[PDB]
Write a protein that binds this ligand. Structure first.
Ligand SMILES: *[C@@H]1O[C@H](CO)[C@@H](O)[C@H](O)[C@H]1NC(C)=O
Ligand SMILES: *[C@@H]1O[C@H](CO)[C@@H](O)[C@H](O)[C@H]1NC(C)=O
Ligand SMILES: *[C@@H]1O[C@H](CO)[C@@H](O)[C@H](O)[C@H]1NC(C)=O
Ligand SMILES: *[C@@H]1O[C@H](CO)[C@@H](O)[C@H](O)[C@H]1NC(C)=O
Ligand SMILES: *[C@@H]1O[C@H](CO)[C@@H](O)[C@H](O)[C@H]1NC(C)=O
Ligand SMILES: *[C@@H]1O[C@H](CO)[C@@H](O)[C@H](O)[C@H]1NC(C)=O
Lengths: 120, 41, 108, 84, 172, 172, 172, 120, 108, 120, 108
């Protein structure tokens, strides 16, 4: 019984930023790494980045380096994503996926969020 | 009777009046402050 | 960066037909770290198979897969009405964490 | 030339009980249970108690003719009464 | 013997060790004698002092029994009071008895660990210049006088200084 | 694996150990076979036998529930009686579950300690005449027949007897 | 330090270990850097996750207090109800405080055991081809490049491969 | 306070078997080895066999190998003895003896059963 | 197989007489593993001495024994009315677990 | 919250002995070494001796060897000092000082007793 | 036996003046084991500084000291009405545990 709840749908304009959250339940403190993957309609799923459970180390895909910033607060067990410098073809559905372990490497996505639709 | 002690436990009588230690039904409560005693070779 | 190619693309069947989904990799996936997900539209994707040979908890016995190297496959012995969705293959043995294209199953 | 590592021992016979061993001899032990009473009804904090004796609480309050010694009592720390 | 030091490879205690739980014994040309390890003993005294003090504070707020009187028509009410006071005393008697038994196991094992740590501290410090006799004693391949022994006791052994001398004697 | 013996450097158990918790396996020219360590197993039996007996005695004085009847004008008294009996049952249910959970952790860790001690006792007894392969097995530098093996099992290995022979093969 | 690893022969932590509880540091001709042990860290995460989830479930069925009103002629009933609630809140407060104190001692000691096991795992795999410095570090008697270092980290060291080279430098 | 209770007296005929039980109290599970010894009137006590406490390993005397079968159940802490192919001179009193340890070897009989008389 | 021979066999005494019971072994008993049991007729045998030198719990102080090798003995300094039964010597250092012949004590 | 209570003031005559007590509170058993320091009016403080916490080992200053006997009872957590063969210039104020550790060596006086005045 | 010589002896000051007390040792005190005590007449002495560089618990911040070898000093930046008493220095790095002469502070 583990569920991930995300924010609502958002509408934005090129040049602005987006703040998508993902709260994880099922325990007092987060024990699994959480990653972010997006699906642009007509295109496949793409991996954006993730954050380690307790130590907060973050890894980002080379495509999105310098534009995405994943942060987490240990107090509220929430993971946030900050994609800045919005441009065309940034409209996609963003999911927060929970890894099978505390680290990003060698772990698969146990559970997925329902998803948030962001348009520019 | 009266109780004159500094220990935190006693087993005289459950009904006490005044500044008294805590009553328990145990026969003994001994804590080990030192290590085990092994005879000299 | 390992690119995953899913061959069938579209596979229209009827309940009872054997379903075989093949996922191909340009490079060998280390330790056979590949996973299969079921993504019904409007719902969060669900983990079916992890490690290319292990079933996720709560997954019905009809879902199974096998493979190694650059060749992996997912087999559904008996198709049910709830087995019509898009299926992706993910490799998690490499840093970029690439994803499969996905194959939609249609109703004949 | 030698050097050795060792641990303290003495002539103690104090015994303690562990989770899965009983009557374990230890070098030093402390008993934290009090089992001794003087057996006398003393005064509490220097205030003598109220000794009814053969007289009862109702007898003292009602002014029983046989409880005339209780017609005037000073401050007390506790009340002493018999079972019957 | 959870850690195998007390009653393990050190099968007997020392009666001449009178100024500390744990320590050393040495024997060379100048003489021999015991020496308690004050630092390890002081750390052991800290846990036991705190362990007992924590015990007192926990049962500081234990249930207290107060006498009550009930008439002959209040049998059910009297039984409730009797079973409440007896039940609370049974709960607190169990907690007091269990805590003493659990701490005694912890204390004896804690004392066992300190010797193993002290034995390993010396072993890792005299890596190759000594023989490990297996009974808690080390035999030096070189000449270790009182100044050399005192360095071993306070963790300042100069292994490179005796490195050359030890290997010549060790080989032949 | 708090002590690193069970499922540690000894990756798997032995199905051929049928007469004891802990033991040895030897293999030389005469033959091979298993042998259980009765002394260490007997010590483990004593701790477990006493561990269970102590558990029974503590909850021997557990709270007991007695049925009572209250009229429809004694709702407060009935609720008071109901919460007392329910409250005591919750306290003792917590104690029974917690004692089992903690004793299981202690028992498994106690079993892990005995192999590490048994491994170290043999290692400290075959100090230099054997190789430490790292998988719980020692390989002798000399010839160790059945009488030699039995000395190792009961802790009577004659290190000076094979001291000269072992170093000749070890060097070359 | 019950197992002597944390604040023992490894007297300082590492600020460069940012992606795991435990790990390695290597330094050779190619370069140097840190590397966390993800397997041991994951196992530690499993105990802590279960240990905390155990704490929540046990006190999930804790006594709950309900307010009641009693007249001026029901002092004994009111006092009896007051002592019941106060007694139960004292029992459960003791359990909550004691469980946290006991689990903190276990958690800190559990982490201490992991390093000692991880230190022993490397030592028993590099039996003779390295030199033990005694401060948690091993110094190789041969050349150990990045491929050789990675083998030690994931437990696939090839001792026979470097067996011949190591003894040539060790002897002289 | 440890007592061993056995079955009642039995009468049999040559060619049949005998099924003698021995229940041990004083604990939840059996922790000591239990052995069987018999005494034929006019003859001394003889050792028949025994069973190890937990592991269930059994040892038999060379005289009675192939005719006696000692089995125990861990659930009920009961020890059973089955002597088959009864013949003449098998009339004796059978006792169940509890060893001082978990194993048969190097242990003495702490307590003895009251005894069962079996006639053929 | 070590056979245990008991020499007295029949020993008539009165309360107060010293009783000395001797058990002889055809072979040396390893580790001095020998025990003495008291078997009053109609009752379960009861352990007196174990190890040939250690007194069992609850045994009156009058019961004691000593010996080594192939020679073992049981000594009762003071005879009581309850010390009239058959006494067996058992060795438990060898595999067969043999028993002694047994010696009945009579009333003079 | 640790306090040391001593005996009252005493008057003695040359040739007699003194028994000054010092009871320490704050715990069930004494875990800190206690020493005795005296100050003769017109003179500075002098160290007389001390006793180790649990093991009872006693150390005395060379000036007072053979005249001072410091003993402690573990049951009552009290320390006694017995100065025999009183003579002139033995009038002083005696304080009992509690060491920072369990041993006399390498430890300083955390707390001091209120003091006892003894006249000869 | 280390003899400790306190130089100022008498130091009359007023609230606000800087107070510097010097303690001198015949031979070097090992491990810088030196302490300072405040002894108001009629009261038990109180520990101000231990180790010559560490402040005791509950001591006001104005009390501080430093030194090494045979030279040690106590400094009070701001003098309060309660800072008028006799100050001693002891060495606890040697067996005799000697004491200082003591210095009384007077009111100007
Ligand atoms: C308590 O007992 C001790 C030792 O017997 C005694 O010194 C003390 O005076 C007693 N207390 C009272 C108040 O009598
Ligand atoms: C214990 O008693 C023996 C005499 O039986 C004595 O030689 C020894 O010194 C004593 N040990 C201690 C610590 O008093
Ligand atoms: C421990 O010793 C006491 C008194 O000597 C005794 O009554 C008790 O039976 C002993 N316990 C065990 C387990 O031997
Ligand atoms: C340890 O003892 C030696 C005496 O051989 C001494 O020279 C050294 O300074 C001591 N080390 C410390 C840190 O006190
Ligand atoms: C240990 O076994 C050997 C067999 O080689 C035997 O000679 C020796 O006596 C035994 N030691 C003990 C104490 O039983
Ligand atoms: C361990 O790492 C080395 C890198 O040199 C690699 O060759 C080997 O396959 C690895 N072992 C495992 C079991 O992954």
């Amino acid at each position: 019984q583990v569920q991930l709840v995300q924010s609502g749908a958002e509408v934005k304009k090129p040049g602005s930023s987006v703040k998508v959250s993902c709260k994880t339940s099922g325990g007092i403190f987060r024990s699994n790494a959480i990653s972010w993957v997006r699906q642009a309609p007509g295109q496949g799923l793409e991996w954006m980045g993730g954050v380690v459970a307790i130590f907060g180390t973050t890894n980002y895909a080379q495509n999105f380096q310098g534009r995405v910033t994943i942060t987490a607060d240990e107090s509220s067990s929430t993971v946030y994503m900050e994609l800045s410098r919005l441009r065309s073809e940034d409209t996609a559905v963003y999911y927060c996926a929970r890894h099978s372990g505390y680290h990003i490497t060698n772990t698969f996505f146990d559970y997925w969020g329902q998803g948030t639709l962001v348009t520019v | 009777g009266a109780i004159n002690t500094t220990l935190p436990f006693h087993n005289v009588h459950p009904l006490t009046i005044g500044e008294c230690p805590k009553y328990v039904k145990s026969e003994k409560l001994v804590l080990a402050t030192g290590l085990r005693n092994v005879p000299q070779i | 960066e390992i690119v995953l190619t899913q061959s069938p693309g579209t596979l229209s069947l009827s309940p009872g037909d054997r379903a075989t989904l093949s996922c191909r990799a340009s490079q060998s996936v280390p330790s056979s770290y590949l996973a299969w997900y079921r993504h019904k539209p409007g719902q969060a994707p669900r983990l079916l198979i992890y490690g290319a040979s292990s079933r996720a908890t709560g997954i019905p016995d009809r879902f199974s897969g096998s493979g190694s190297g650059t060749d992996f496959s997912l087999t559904i012995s008996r198709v049910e009405p709830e087995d019509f969705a898009v299926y992706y293959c993910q490799q998690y043995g490499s840093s970029p964490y690439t994803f499969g294209r996905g194959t939609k199953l249609d109703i004949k | 030339d030698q050097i050795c590592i060792g641990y303290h021992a003495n002539n103690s016979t104090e015994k303690v009980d562990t989770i899965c061993e009983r009557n374990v001899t230890v070098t030093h032990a402390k008993d934290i249970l009090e089992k001794t009473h003087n057996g006398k009804l003393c005064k509490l904090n220097g205030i003598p108690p109220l000794e009814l004796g053969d007289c009862s609480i109702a007898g003292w309050l009602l002014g029983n003719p046989e409880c005339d010694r209780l017609l005037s009592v000073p401050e007390w720390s506790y009340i002493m009464e018999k079972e019957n | 013997g959870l850690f195998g030091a007390i009653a393990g490879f050190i099968e007997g205690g020392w009666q001449g060790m009178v100024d500390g739980w744990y320590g050393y014994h040495h024997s060379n040309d100048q003489g021999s004698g015991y020496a308690a390890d004050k630092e390890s003993t002081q750390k052991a005294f800290d846990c036991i002092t705190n362990k007992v003090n924590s015990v007192i504070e926990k049962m500081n707020t234990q249930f207290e029994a107060v006498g009550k009187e009930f008439s002959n028509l209040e049998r059910r009410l009297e039984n409730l009071n009797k079973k409440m006071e007896d039940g609370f005393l049974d709960v607190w008697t169990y907690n007091a008895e269990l805590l003493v038994l659990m701490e005694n196991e912890r204390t004896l094992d804690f004392h066992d660990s300190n010797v193993k740590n002290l034995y390993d501290k010396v072993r890792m410090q005299l890596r190759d210049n000594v023989k490990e006799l297996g009974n808690g004693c080390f035999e030096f391949y070189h000449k270790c006088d009182d100044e050399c022994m005192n360095s071993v006791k306070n963790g300042t052994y100069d292994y490179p200084k005796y490195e050359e001398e030890s290997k010549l004697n060790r080989n032949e």
